[PDB]
Scaffold this active site. Sequence first.
Site, PDB file in Angstrom:
ATOM      1  N   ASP A 114      -6.501  -2.150   0.750  1.00 28.98           N
ATOM      2  CA  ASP A 114      -5.209  -1.712   0.224  1.00 28.98           C
ATOM      3  C   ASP A 114      -5.136  -1.871  -1.299  1.00 28.98           C
ATOM      4  OD1 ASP A 114      -2.640  -0.758   0.058  1.00 28.98           O
ATOM      5  OD2 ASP A 114      -1.676  -2.585   0.879  1.00 28.98           O
ATOM      6  N   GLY A 164       9.545  -3.837  -1.639  1.00 30.57           N
ATOM      7  CA  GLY A 164       9.716  -3.494  -3.033  1.00 30.57           C
ATOM      8  C   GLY A 164       8.851  -4.269  -3.980  1.00 30.57           C
ATOM      9  N   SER A 184       5.654  -4.653  -3.069  1.00 31.19           N
ATOM     10  CA  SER A 184       4.416  -3.972  -2.742  1.00 31.19           C
ATOM     11  C   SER A 184       3.709  -3.534  -3.999  1.00 31.19           C
ATOM     12  CB  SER A 184       4.692  -2.676  -1.944  1.00 31.19           C
ATOM     13  OG  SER A 184       4.997  -2.923  -0.631  1.00 31.19           O
ATOM     14  N   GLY A 185       2.391  -3.808  -4.074  1.00 29.38           N
ATOM     15  CA  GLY A 185       1.572  -3.354  -5.176  1.00 29.38           C
ATOM     16  C   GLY A 185       1.518  -4.291  -6.343  1.00 29.38           C
ATOM     17  N   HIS A 198      -1.071   1.629  -0.355  1.00 33.96           N
ATOM     18  CA  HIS A 198       0.077   2.061   0.430  1.00 33.96           C
ATOM     19  C   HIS A 198       1.208   2.458  -0.520  1.00 33.96           C
ATOM     20  CE1 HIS A 198       1.751  -2.190   0.240  1.00 33.96           C
ATOM     21  NE2 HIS A 198       2.897  -1.554   0.285  1.00 33.96           N
TER      22      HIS A 198
HETATM   23  N1  LIG Z   1       5.312 -10.323   2.503  1.00 34.28           N
HETATM   24  C1  LIG Z   1       5.482  -8.886   2.879  1.00 34.28           C
HETATM   25  C2  LIG Z   1       5.555  -7.969   1.620  1.00 34.28           C
HETATM   26  C3  LIG Z   1       5.800  -6.624   1.971  1.00 34.28           C
HETATM   27  C4  LIG Z   1       6.979  -6.250   2.592  1.00 34.28           C
HETATM   28  C5  LIG Z   1       7.249  -4.946   2.976  1.00 34.28           C
HETATM   29  C6  LIG Z   1       6.327  -3.940   2.733  1.00 34.28           C
HETATM   30  C7  LIG Z   1       5.151  -4.296   2.098  1.00 34.28           C
HETATM   31  C8  LIG Z   1       4.901  -5.597   1.731  1.00 34.28           C
END
Ligand SMILES: [NH3+]CCc1ccccc1
Length: 223
Positions: A84, A175, A177-178, A40
């Site tokens: 993902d 933020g 993410s990844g 994503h």
């Molecule tokens: N614990 C959620 C982490 C998260 C939050 C927002 C977008 C992607 C991932």
Amino acid sequence: IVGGYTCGANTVPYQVSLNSGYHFCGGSLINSQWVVSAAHCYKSGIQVRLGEDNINVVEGNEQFISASKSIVHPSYNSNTLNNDIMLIKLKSAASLNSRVASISLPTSCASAGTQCLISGWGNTKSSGTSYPDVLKCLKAPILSDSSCKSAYPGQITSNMFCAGYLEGGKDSCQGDSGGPVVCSGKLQGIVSWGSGCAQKNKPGVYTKVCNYVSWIKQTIASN
Ligand SMILES: [NH3+]CCc1ccccc1
Ligand SMILES: [Ca+2]
């Protein structure tokens, strides 16, 4: 990261920031030319930033390297976030050193109750917004698959796990993410999704990397 602590500069040397004019996702360095992140997080024009602590200040240990190729998992489903995971090849090999180092892939899956380190430059507030400049860290255990599935009925697959605290207050957030979930020295997860951040009974959901090791190793060797 909500409820976490300042890691300290270069304490997480496999942590990368993906930059498209601004930090937008984390990732993990798995060898000198390849990064693991979330599918994503896909976008064109990615620069990988290695050796970062403050993402807004050049402090002296950074390596900025453009991505040459991105490979989203063949079965990524953006609706459900199943599978993902994405690989990013660096246009040139990173110079490996103290502050820039790879993280090993799992040899097997990790167990419920295992403690892991989650890290990133995401929001630090559970209501509201505050983005840190320096890297944040959180220690959190892998949750049982049944509590994960109870938290998110109909949405957890075998390629996902939950980690964190059902009471809330400690979680990954926007933020992050990844970025990495490292347990016993191995990259076992990637920050993937959740329902808000650090809320009660809504722990973070992470891509279960141990299911992807054969795909990762085959993909890298052929690319
Ligand atoms: N614990 C959620 C982490 C998260 C939050 C927002 C977008 C992607 C991932
Ligand atoms: Ca910096």
